[PDB]
């Protein structure tokens, strides 16, 4: 069986003083199509493959192509994946929950470099022999993630730096906990990064959370992000504040809101301020199909 | 929801004396696939996105890719679109009704340069930040079209020439009228073009029409095209004659026929002669799927 | 109507002493998606078009694109195809039946160069104006194939070498016979190649066969491949031995097995040795969707 799913999003993206002779406000949009082939068996083992076709405004050649494939095998709560995999630091829960606006961005997200699923082709040729293996398991309300990424599988392994990561999250109805660690993140020797987060569902309506990072070799240093959200009917309000160790950085912050216009249709906007005082704002829609 | 539709066409395309050491007759073919994602809401607002994958014989690299996306929102007869939009001069009725043959061509089509939906990627990099906005409305048997195209939305607007167009068409059972105007067509300063057309359905079987253009800065100058068609059962016969102001140009003309072999299957051919005496002929099929 | 089908395969591919500073064992995988549009008519003539999107590990840019299209028309057992066609030497039965392992390879396959359906784009620009025509017919348990491939249809024909091929196969329940011949194979003047094969189904379970080739201008010279397979429940065992005329070449051979894990899911592996003593091995899965 082959299924197709995806989403479109478009709206206004504003970046204060974007650049000499550049407009500060543009129309930023994205079309994402996922192509999934699955083979179910009577033995309970499911095999699958996926491809993504993603277009973003500004893309080179005004064209869209597929990325590199991902393959998986699932059996009894265990999933093994190969090729262009989802990585542990990028898949744990809570680490991206301060994101807001129609482009789901936040200066409070980790400031480090690490491998993650590649949505598009890479013209530099850097990903041509990139191959990963990942294993996930949901044991109880516990989720475990493991990933191994080799940036160039064809070359003798002693010449390349491979990325290894682990993560786990756990949740009941009101508290959630998550942690991750990855060594040689992004294939950079000694760029070891870690995450610990927790969130409290202080209502069916509200949530407050705190994420802490060790950003490895990034110039940002350690980081802490405190964020929260509250739902009022169809509208959700969100906010966050984040600090990094880099000398002289400002405190980043943002405030935004989502409006659930209909099932699959979300209108969002946000106003944020970064670590270097950058001012960014957005407003737009996302529709799922 | 995601739907796929398209067509294939193949046949013979002949160009008298195409070129030194070139064959005059080749097999010209096209495969077009449209990918449409839509999200319907109970509020009556529909959101959609579309992507096209088009291959034509002769294309570079013997490969096919997607173009740049188009997004829209429809509500009560009004449609707003963003990104790679359909433009007003390219969408009005009547302006392409002299086209004939399996590749739907005509020297009687307007000889000017103007933006229109881009079916494919552009290797020159000229379309990378091209973004348009369009609005259509069917008020009665009236159709109104408006389009705004910015060839490079990232650059300060005083440095770029934007294209603005309007058009309207109207029809009852026997007369149709259409007009369009576009300023700085194709992003070329002072290339302002206009169209006025009318057609008379002198039967359930026949139609005669006349289109007039102002081709802006093109060397063709003003143009007039008189065309007609008549249906005899499953076969339709078509003809046209067109004249442009360019000094020394010949009168262009063409005669062709369509045969409706079955629903979705059309066999067509034509013999045409251009403004510079070029002789072109074709015969082939198109099937819709 | 538009349908999508395909397969994914992944596993380990081992090549003894692949190269200085290279790993001998890598994870080799492929994702293939076929896009087929068809228009059926009440007259019994079916029209179709197809596109392929294929990704293999190692591909340039870590991306996937469509290839060049293929068009066909079928009526009463006769199929005419145009564009990126299937060729006669590549479509006859028996010629690839010694292939084994999850990547279906065999040194016993013909060692010659000839045109065949192109699964992907070609960055060299060599296929940009490549166009073929093919005709197939199943008259009784007989299959006939004819193909004509012009490597550059736009250029005067006396300047290009076109490939012409024919083939036929025939089968009852226990014997199969096949033959093919192609002149100027692969567009190489005087590279004329031929195939004759026969197979004996000495059981419902076993088969032994013999293929003979004339490899035209290849340095391999004439070749003979003797192969066999035997099914034991869900597992199939296969073997082959092949010899070529090239002076000093070794005898190639291989042994492998397939395991039908479920409908659409096949686990395969093989160990093979080539004409230059290369040692290659594989183990992996293929799933159809
Ligand atoms: C095989 C899938 C198609 C992907 C091929 C695209 C190849 C394009 O690059 C060729 C070399 O030129 C360099 C491109 O410039 C950067 C492109 O990507 C960035 C998106 O904005
Ligand atoms: C060129 C300027 C236009 C670009 C700016 C887009 C800015 C739009 O977003 C502002 C809205 O952000 C949300 C504010 O937080 C309050 C939410 O609650 C109020 C209404 O539900
Ligand atoms: C058709 C008239 C010319 C249009 C003026 C050009 C001005 C450019 O755009 C300004 C902003 O308006 C359009 C954008 O569509 C995205 C809006 O936000 C999404 C819904 O929440
Ligand atoms: C990202 C979508 C894939 C589109 C990328 C194609 C990029 C190819 O160009 C790279 C630079 O080389 C120039 C190409 O020659 C012209 C191609 O287009 C014309 C069609 O016949
Ligand atoms: C190399 C020469 C072959 C290429 C030429 C293709 C020419 C085929 O088209 C000629 C047919 O055009 C239609 C003529 O107008 C008369 C229509 O009514 C008659 C039958 O229904
Ligand atoms: C298989 C024998 C070799 C074929 C001869 C090569 C000659 C090249 O083509 C000549 C014209 O015929 C084929 C084209 O298919 C398109 C025909 O028109 C479409 C249906 O109305
Ligand atoms: C139009 C469809 C997209 C296909 C375009 C890809 C164009 C890429 O090449 C541009 C020129 O650079 C040369 C590429 O290197 C070889 C690529 O193919 C081999 C697969 O491993
Ligand atoms: C780095 C080494 C790993 C790569 C080698 C893969 C080798 C795996 O394939 C060996 C199996 O080949 C099949 C053998 O023939 C006997 C079949 O019958 C026995 C079980 O059903
Ligand atoms: C997650 C721990 C790190 C993984 C070790 C890296 C070693 C690389 O791979 C070794 C072989 O195992 C994995 C391959 O998946 C394909 C196996 O064969 C397919 C099923 O028949």
Task: Please report, for the domain that includes residue C166, its CATH number.
Answer: 2.40.160.10
Please give the tally of structural domains in chain C.
Answer: 1
Look at C58 and A2 and tell me if their CB atoms are within 8 Å: no
Are the Cβ atoms of A47 and C7 closer than 8 angstroms?
no
- Spatial distance between the Cα atoms of C173 and A157, rounded to a whole number of angstroms: 52
Residue A271: how many CB atoms within 10 A of its CB?
16
Phi, psi of A229 (to 5 degrees): -150, 155
Report how this structure was experimentally obtained. Answer: X-ray
Q: Best mutation site among C8, C59, C66, C266 for testing chain A: the one with the most A CBs within 10 Å?
A: C8
Resolution (in Å) of the shown entry?
2.2
How far apart (Å, rounded) are the C-alpha atoms in residues B157 and A201?
Answer: 47
Residue with tokens 């097999």: B27
In whole angstroms, what is the distance from residue B54 CA to residue B120 CA?
7
Angle at A276 between CA A272 and CA A281, to 5 degrees: 20
Is B68's CB within 8 Å of A65's CB?
no
Q: C215, C199, C211: which is closest to C249 by C-alpha? A: C215
Cβ(A256)–Cβ(A108) under 8 Å?
no
Chain B contacts in chain C segment 202-241 (CB below 8 A): none
Cβ–ligand 2 contact at A237 (below 6 Å)? yes
CB contact under 8 Å between C121 and B288, yes or no, is no
Q: Give the Cβ contact number of residue C219 at 10 Å.
A: 11
Taking the C-alpha atoms of residue C249 and residue C220, their distance in angstroms, rounded to an integer, is: 9
CB-CB contact of B258 with B267 (8 Å):
yes
What are the φ and ψ backbone dihedral angles of B44, each rounded to 5 degrees?
85, 5
Q: From ligand 2's centre to the CA of A281, what distance in Å?
A: 7
Asked if A189 reaches chain B (Cβ–Cβ under 8 Å), the answer is no
The whole-angstrom distance between B221's CA and the closest CA on chain A is 32
Q: How far is A196 from chain C (nearest CA, A)?
A: 33
Neighbours of B42 (CB within 10 A): 7
Which are the contacts of B205, defined by CB distance < 8 A and separation ≥ 6?
Answer: B230, B231, B232
* Environment class of A46 (CB within 10 Å of its CB; exposed 0-12, middle 13-18, buried 19+): middle
The residues, any chain, with a CB within 8 Å of residue A216's CB and separated by 6 or more, are A112, A113, A185, A188, A190, A191, A192, A193
Query: How many angstroms separate the alpha carbon of residue B59 from the centre of ligand 4?
Result: 9
Q: Dihedral sign, CA of A204, A210, A215, A219?
A: positive
- What H or E segment, with its residue span, contains residue A88? helix A88-91
Find the helix or strand (DSSP H, E) in which C90 lies. Answer: helix C88-91
**Contact between B31 and C69 (Cβ < 8 Å):** yes
First to last CA, chain A: 18
Q: In chain B, which ranges are continuous DSSP H helix?
A: 88-91
Q: Answer yes or no: is the C-beta of A11 below 6 A from any ligand 3 atom.
A: yes
Return the number of other C-beta atoms located less than 10 Å from residue C110's C-beta: 26
C-beta atoms surrounding A253 within 10 Å: 19
Across the interface, whether the CB atoms of B289 and C39 are under 8 A apart is answered yes
A280 Cβ inside 6 Å of ligand 2: no
Residues in chain B with CB shorter than 8 Å from the CB of C120 are 63
Residue A121, Cα to own-chain centre: how many angstroms? Answer: 18
Question: Other C-beta atoms within 10 Å of C193: how many?
Answer: 25
* Spatial distance between the Cα atoms of A213 and B272, rounded to a whole number of angstroms: 71
Interchain contact, B129 vs A64, CB within 8 Å: no
Chain C stretch 54-113, residues whose beta carbon is closer than 8 A to a beta carbon of chain B = 65-69, 71, 73, 82-84
H/E segment holding residue A92? none
Closest-CA residue, ligand 8 atom 15, reads C256
Map residue C80 onto helix, strand or coil: strand
Distance, in Å, from the CA atom of C269 to the CA atom of C235, rounded to the nearest integer, reads 12
Q: How far is A68 from chain B (nearest CA, A)?
A: 15
Structural domain that includes position C273: 1-289
């Amino acid at each position: 069986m082959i299924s197709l799913n995806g989403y479109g999003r478009f709206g206004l993206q504003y970046v204060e003083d974007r650049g000499v002779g550049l407009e500060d406000t543009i129309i930023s949009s994205r079309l994402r199509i996922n192509i999934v082939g699955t083979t179910e068996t009577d033995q309970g083992v499911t095999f699958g493959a996926k491809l993504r076709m993603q277009w973003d405004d500004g893309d080179a050649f005004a064209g869209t192509a597929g990325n590199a494939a991902q393959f998986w095998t699932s059996y009894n709560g265990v999933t093994v994946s190969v090729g262009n995999v989802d990585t542990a630091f990028d898949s744990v829960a809570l680490t991206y929950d301060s994101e807001m606006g129609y482009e789901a961005s936040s200066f409070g997200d980790a400031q480090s470099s690490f491998f993650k699923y590649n949505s598009k082709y890479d013209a530099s040729g850097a990903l041509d022999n990139y191959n990963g293996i990942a294993v996930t398991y949901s044991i109880s309300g516990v989720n475990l993630y493991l990933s191994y990424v080799d940036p160039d599988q064809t070359v003798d392994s002693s010449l390349v730096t491979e990325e290894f990561g682990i993560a786990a999250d756990w949740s009941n109805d009101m508290i959630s906990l998550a942690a991750a660690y990855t060594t040689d993140a992004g294939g950079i020797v000694d760029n070891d990064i870690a995450f610990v987060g927790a969130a409290y569902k202080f209502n069916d309506a509200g949530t407050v959370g705190l994420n802490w990072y060790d950003n490895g070799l990034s110039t940002a240093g350690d980081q802490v992000t405190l964020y929260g959200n509250y739902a009022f009917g169809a509208t959700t309000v969100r906010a966050y504040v984040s600090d990094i160790d880099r000398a002289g950085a400002d405190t980043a912050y943002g405030i935004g809101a989502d409006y659930q216009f209909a099932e699959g249709v979300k209108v969002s906007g946000s106003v944020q301020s970064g670590f270097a005082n950058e001012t960014v704002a957005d407003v737009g829609v996302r529709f799922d199909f």
